[PDB]
Amino acid sequence: MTFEYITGKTGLKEICKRLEKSPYLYLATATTGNRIRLVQLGDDEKTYVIDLYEIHDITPLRELISEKGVIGHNLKFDLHYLMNYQIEPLATFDTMIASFLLGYERHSLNHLVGNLLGYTLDKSYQLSDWGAPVLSDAQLKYAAKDVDVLRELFPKLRDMLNELEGERGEELLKTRTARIFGLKSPVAIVEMAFVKEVAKLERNGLPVDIETLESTLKDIERKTQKKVQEFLIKFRVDPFSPKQVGQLLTSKYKLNLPRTQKGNVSTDDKVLSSYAHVEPVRLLLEIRKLKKLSDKFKEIKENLKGDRLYPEFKQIGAVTGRMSSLKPNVQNVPREERAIFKAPEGNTFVIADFSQIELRIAAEYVNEELMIRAFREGKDLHRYTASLVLGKREEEITKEERQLAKAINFGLIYGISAKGLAEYARTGYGVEISEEEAETFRNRFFKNFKAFKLWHEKVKKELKEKGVFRGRTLLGRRFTATTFNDAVNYPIQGTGADLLKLAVLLFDAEAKKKKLDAKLVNLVHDEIVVECRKEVANQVKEVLEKAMKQAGKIILKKVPVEVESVINERWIKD
């Protein structure tokens, strides 16, 4: 029809020669089980449906794609199938990632066609059998259409992405992803290049020491059994029974607990947090925390394939650009329990983090010149803030007061209330201060760090007027917040997500230049973990650190970015 059906070497070689002239390729696949049945390609004028069941040697196809940027929808899955055929594109532009960055509420190819081309996409053949001996012409046309919609969508999405200007990232305009696709938005350039990193991450997996898992799980269950029976002996109440624990808290301890149910009394974690000072409640919470942990360890064991976990990743798990992982999520494992994650024999981890990066980003974002100058002078910002809010001198600050100032710094940059600060000091740091003390610290904090107070007031003003706050990360990633807490967190966490992804991209390019073999195995918050052979680990660490600082210097122009790293067989920073 409007496409050429390719079933032989000579045809494949012709069209591959014809596609060598294109600036990029539109790409889709039709898969069956492990295999690709069809690869659909297009330039700006022609569409090809390539039947891998009829072609014994796809060397021209492999060679062509390896030198081209490809344009497709949710390319991570195509990348997985293509890697099964030793095929990897030079660069990627993902219309699904584009729709995330542009703020749509649905990101299917059908939603994009409906909104930008003004019609509904046919799905009559979405579930057809791509493993059948004979495909119908209707099936081949259905496969070809995916290329034709991508050709129509691409310039619109590219042009809309190019309106996402950033205050940083001009250095990315020369990169291949930006030049190949005509991309000028720094956040777009990063996320389009990052698609390949998520695909590799999803295939690499995270290795687990099952023996350490099993014996530590024993310890948790052993400790849980001890606390449960202590509770049973203390209260003669089953701590796992909502019946007995439910109104024992109301009958003995006279605690005004709500409904949800119409049999009811509610004793979930949210309500009980307000009564951590009541002995049965504190003991209940301690038991539940031990149970969550052992549940997580059992979930990890149950998701092992050999000695590795293979969670699924969402490249953009929230509007901040942070990824999410499911199947299992290990980001909630406490740091002190991450010893269960251990490279396989002969390998090791390189663990690298951006020091105080959230504070450094906030200081530059808000142009807080007291904190910028402290960071530029190499001061300890927690010790510095401790001196300001406590009225002592910096060298006199104890390490306990420094912990209190940590909570002050990480809390008050988001303008939380005095009550919220006292709450956050307790739960995040084990620090006990009264609401009155928190108010005093809050006043001294904003008296000194005026730019943060001015920023919080600006933000509240805008939210009052328009009900939303529309801002951007330093790379141009947009967000729309409807609460004050989202409006101040989103630009900082989003800039932090931009930085981590950018650091990974720079690491990968520099690792390829040096012919270094290394796998990304975890990326979260401020920390990058890669796995490599022991004999190259020192080189990988140096490459990772220099890529990280390169990323920091692109994002932050006034605040220096510090990086620390260790080499450890286990996911422990010691």
Residue whose tokens read 């910002």: 381
318 and 302 in one domain? no
Give a yes or no: residue 81 inside a domain: yes
Give a yes or no: residue 278 inside a domain: yes
224 and 277 in one domain? yes
| Phi, psi dihedral angles at 240 (to 5 degrees) | -100, 10
Give a yes or no: residue 250 inside a domain: yes
Domain that residue 332 falls in: 312-368+457-574
What value, to the nearest 5°, has the Cα angle with vertex 65 and ends 61 and 66?
Answer: 115
CA distance 436 to 423: 12
Tokens matching residue 250? 């109301």
Tokens matching residue 204? 């690499």
- Are the C-beta atoms of 468 and 481 separated by less than 8 Å? yes
Give a yes or no: residue 252 inside a domain: yes
> How many residues would you count in the chain?
574
22 burial via Cβ count (<10 Å: 0-12, 13-18, 19+): middle
Count of CA atoms in the C-beta half-sphere (13 A) of 204 = 21
CA distance 241 to 284: 11
Give a yes or no: residue 34 inside a domain: yes
- Are the C-beta atoms of 267 and 255 separated by less than 8 Å? no
Closest CA to 313 of 169, 97, 146: 97
The DSSP line for 401-431 is: HHHHHHHHHHHHTTT--HHHHHHHHHHHH--
Residue whose tokens read 């306990």: 400
Instruction: Round the CA-based radius of gyration of the chain to a whole number and report it.
Output: 27
Coil, strand or helix: which one is 333? coil
- Are the C-beta atoms of 471 and 479 separated by less than 8 Å? yes
Residues of the chain by 3-state class (helix, strand, coil), percent to 5: 55, 15, 30
For 244, 248, 282, 296, 572, the CA distances from 287, given in Å and listed in that order, are 16, 17, 9, 14, 26
212 burial via Cβ count (<10 Å: 0-12, 13-18, 19+): middle
403 and 260 in one domain? no
Give a yes or no: residue 48 inside a domain: yes
Coil, strand or helix: which one is 15? helix
Q: Give CA 384 to chain center in angstroms.
A: 31
Adjacent-strand bridge partners of 527: 353, 524
CA distance 255 to 297: 33
Adjacent-strand bridge partners of 326: 312
> What region, left, alpha or beta, does residue 365 occupy, with left being phi > 0 and alpha being psi -120 to 50 degrees?
alpha
CA distance 168 to 377: 23
As a whole number of Å, the end-to-end CA separation of the chain is 63
Torsion from C-alpha of 163, 164, 167, 170, nearest 10 degrees: -80
Out of 423, 448, 473, a domain closes at 448
For 182, 275, 472, 500, the CA distances from 550, given in Å and listed in that order, are 23, 47, 21, 11
Torsion from C-alpha of 108, 112, 118, 124, nearest 10 degrees: -30
Name all contacts of 83-87 with Cβ < 8 Å and 24+ positions apart.
83/199, 83/203, 84/34, 84/35, 84/36, 85/36, 85/52, 85/58, 86/62, 87/58, 87/61, 87/62
Give a yes or no: residue 193 inside a domain: no
CB neighbours of 344 closer than 8 A, spacing ≥ 6? 207, 307
Q: How was this structure determined?
A: X-ray
- Are the C-beta atoms of 494 and 477 separated by less than 8 Å? yes
Residue whose tokens read 């939303």: 468
Coil, strand or helix: which one is 441? helix
Q: 238: domain CATH number?
A: 1.20.1060.10
Q: Give CA 264 to chain center in angstroms.
A: 38
For 56, 151, 351, 422, 524, the CA distances from 416, given in Å and listed in that order, are 64, 48, 32, 10, 24
486 and 568 in one domain? yes
- Measured in angstroms, the resolution is 2.2
| Phi, psi dihedral angles at 458 (to 5 degrees) | -45, -55
329 and 227 in one domain? no
Out of 419, 448, 477, a domain closes at 448
- If one counts every other C-beta atom within 10 angstroms of the C-beta of residue 405, the result is 26
- Can the peptide bond before residue 311 be classed as cis, meaning omega within 30 degrees of 0? no
Out of 306, 322, 350, a domain closes at 306
Q: 9: domain CATH number?
A: 3.30.420.10
CA distance 504 to 540: 12
CA distance 546 to 191: 21
Closest CA to 531 of 311, 543, 540: 540
390 and 496 in one domain? no
Q: Are strands 47-51 and 35-42 parallel, antiparallel or unpaired?
A: antiparallel
CA distance 280 to 245: 9
504 and 397 in one domain? no
- Are the C-beta atoms of 38 and 130 separated by less than 8 Å? yes
Tokens matching residue 31? 């898969």
Tokens matching residue 205? 């997996």
CA distance 470 to 314: 23
325 and 268 in one domain? no
Give a yes or no: residue 200 inside a domain: no
Domain count, the chain: 4
- Are the C-beta atoms of 414 and 488 separated by less than 8 Å? yes
342 and 291 in one domain? no
Q: Secondary structure of 512-537 in the HEC alphabet? A: HHCCCCCEEEEEECCEEEEEEEHHHH
Closest CA to 325 of 337, 316, 338: 316
For 238, 278, 571, the CA distances from 254, given in Å and listed in that order, are 18, 11, 45
Q: Secondary structure of 56-68 in the HEC alphabet? A: CCCHHHHHHHHCC
CA distance 496 to 552: 10
Torsion from C-alpha of 158, 164, 168, 172, nearest 10 degrees: 0
Tokens matching residue 451? 């730019």
Q: Are strands 25-32 and 35-42 parallel, antiparallel or unpaired?
A: antiparallel
For 227, 415, 471, 485, 531, the CA distances from 463, given in Å and listed in that order, are 47, 15, 12, 11, 44
CB neighbours of 281 closer than 8 A, spacing ≥ 6? 249, 253, 255, 272, 275
Closest CA to 433 of 384, 382, 389, 480: 389
Q: Secondary structure of 351-393 in the HEC alphabet? A: EEEECCHHHHHHHHHHCCHHHHHHHHCCCCHHHHHHHHHHCCC
Closest CA to 335 of 563, 549, 108, 571: 571
147 and 268 in one domain? no
> What region, left, alpha or beta, does residue 43 occupy, with left being phi > 0 and alpha being psi -120 to 50 degrees?
beta
CA distance 36 to 130: 9
Tokens matching residue 76? 């991570």
132 and 77 in one domain? yes
CB neighbours of 557 closer than 8 A, spacing ≥ 6? 168, 364
510 and 558 in one domain? yes
DSSP H/E element including 155: helix 137-161
277 burial via Cβ count (<10 Å: 0-12, 13-18, 19+): exposed
Closest CA to 323 of 530, 497, 489, 201: 497
What is the amino acid identity at position 471?
A: G
The DSSP line for 25-83 is: EEEEEEEETTEEEEEEEE-SS-EEEEETTS-S--HHHHHHHHTSEEEESSHHHHHHHHH
DSSP 120: P
307 burial via Cβ count (<10 Å: 0-12, 13-18, 19+): middle
- Are the C-beta atoms of 54 and 61 separated by less than 8 Å? no
CA distance 479 to 482: 10
What is the amino acid identity at position 75?
A: L
Coil, strand or helix: which one is 7? coil
CA distance 253 to 280: 9
- Are the C-beta atoms of 519 and 204 separated by less than 8 Å? yes
Coil, strand or helix: which one is 309? strand
1 burial via Cβ count (<10 Å: 0-12, 13-18, 19+): exposed
- If one counts every other C-beta atom within 10 angstroms of the C-beta of residue 252, the result is 12
CB neighbours of 436 closer than 8 A, spacing ≥ 6? none
DSSP 480: E
Closest CA to 561 of 573, 569, 553: 553
Q: 471: domain CATH number?
A: 3.30.70.370
Tokens matching residue 9? 């070497």
